[PDB]
Amino acid sequence: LHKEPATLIKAIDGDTVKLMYKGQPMTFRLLLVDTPEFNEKYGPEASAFTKKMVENAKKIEVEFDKGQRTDKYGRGLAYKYADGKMVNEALVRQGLAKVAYVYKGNNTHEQLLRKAEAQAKKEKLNIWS
Numbered sequence: 863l864h865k866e867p868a869t870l871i872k873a874i875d876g877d878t879v880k881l882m883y884k885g886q887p888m889t890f891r892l893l894l895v896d897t898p899e900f901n902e903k904y905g906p907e908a909s910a911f912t913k914k915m916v917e918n919a920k921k922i923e924v925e926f927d928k929g930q931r932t933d934k935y936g937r938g939l940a941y942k943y944a945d946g947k948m949v950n951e952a953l954v955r956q957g958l959a960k961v962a963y964v965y966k967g968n969n970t971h972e973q974l975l976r977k978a979e980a981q982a983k984k985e986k987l988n989i990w991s
């Protein structure tokens with residue numbers, strides 16, 4: 863997989879963000895994770911966590927997986943990095959997202975993220991409390 867440049871346009875919620883990618887605005891949905899909707903428990907915390915992470919980043923990158931790059935809503939599907947740290951993994955390690963939506967062919971970082979979820983559950987963090 864390869865990291866590509868993007869710039870922040872605006873935080874949306876725990877697992878979606880609007881970025882400018884190859885010069886075009888697009889909403890990205892983070893691969894392999896599910897945050898609670900803003901209206902649910904830990905929803906506000908997840909949105910705040912991603913917002914801080916993406917707004918504080920000096921360099922944002924997106925990394926597509928091997929499979930579909932857009933979903934049925936026209937959202938980009940990617941791993942997102944903020945100054946070299948993967949947002950997808952960081953949300954799971956913090957118990958602010960569950961590993962979810964694992965579809966054959968877009969699952970390169972599945973085992974990395976499961977490993978993060980195990981540690982978050984071990985620690986009873988957030989969703990796992």
Ligand SMILES: Cc1cn([C@H]2C[C@H](OP(=O)(O)O)[C@@H](COP(=O)(O)O)O2)c(=O)[nH]c1=O
Pocket residue numbers: 891892893894895896933934939963965968
């Ligand atoms: C993460 C992800 C979501 N989706 C679709 C599945 C779900 O369809 P439905 O909307 O029909 O439930 C929806 C979940 O996204 P959200 O969690 O953002 O709602 O997005 C994909 O198709 N591929 C993916 O990799």
Ligand SMILES: [Ca+2]
Pocket residue numbers: 877896897898899
């Ligand atoms: Ca969600």
